[PDB]
């Protein structure tokens, strides 16, 4: 349940440490991004020599959230902190080459298959 101004950790090695959702993309008046949802983000804090710099506006896919995800048996998976993976703003393909921390099977699909392949865990 990410919205404009929400800060997210970077689950990637793109060079962002912290990003801020600028826009929930998708529909008119769409309030919230969930896991799987692409958001426009601004890089608020980045590592010294990385692919992305402070202030770089780009896309990102939310991969972990405190609100988490309901599964069809009624289960719910919640993460301690909100994270995302920066994507090329045109191609929507991950900037980084390594994912940090678990992800969910909600990313499973054609779009974010690389993320799922690289993630240390998929819950």
């Amino acid at each position: 349940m990410i919205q404009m101004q929400s800060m997210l950790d970077a689950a990637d090695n793109s060079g962002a440490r912290s990003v801020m959702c600028i826009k929930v993309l998708g529909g008119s008046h769409r309030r919230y991004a969930h896991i799987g949802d692409v958001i426009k983000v601004t890089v608020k804090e980045a590592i010294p020599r990385g692919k992305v710099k402070k202030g770089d506006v780009l896309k990102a896919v939310v991969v972990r959230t405190r609100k988490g995800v309901r599964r069809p048996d009624g289960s719910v998976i919640r993460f301690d902190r909100n994270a995302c993976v920066l994507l090329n703003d045109n191609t929507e393909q991950p900037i980084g080459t390594r994912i940090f921390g678990p992800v969910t099977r909600e990313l499973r699909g054609d779009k974010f298959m690389k993320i799922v392949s690289l993630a240390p865990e998929v819950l």
Binding site: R64, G68, G74, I77, R78, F79, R81, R105, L123
Partner: protein
């Protein structure tokens, strides 16, 4: 309701291992990756248990790849294939949500050790 009770007790799992808050459990969770059906193990501490017949649940908190993860399971769901209690914990409370704010040494639970 006797009607709802009859309907619920037909669906209830027969033999579930006794676990308690503070236990370290390993839940074997049924995952289906396209066609293939495997078991995936969720190992962590029981921090909460809802006793509500078929509506029973339990929350397990693990720290995975540097990330806190909690999962509320529905005990009687088919998806939960098995629960193994690895360690019995000694706690003084029903719900260990205080563990959300602890880490490492602070997050350790005492063994019950009959």
């Amino acid at each position: 309701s006797n009607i709802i009770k009859a309907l619920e007790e037909e669906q209830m799992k027969s033999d579930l291992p006794k676990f308690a808050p503070g236990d370290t459990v390993v839940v074997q969770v049924k995952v289906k990756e396209g066609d293939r059906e495997r078991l995936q193990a969720f190992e962590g501490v029981v921090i909460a248990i809802r006793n509500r017949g078929l509506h029973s649940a339990f929350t397990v908190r693990k720290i995975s790849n540097g990330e806190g993860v909690e999962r509320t399971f529905q005990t009687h769901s088919p998806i939960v294939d098995s629960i193994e209690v690895k360690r019995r914990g000694a706690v003084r409370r029903a719900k260990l949500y205080y563990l959300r704010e602890r880490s490492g040494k602070s997050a350790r639970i005492k063994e019950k050790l009959a």
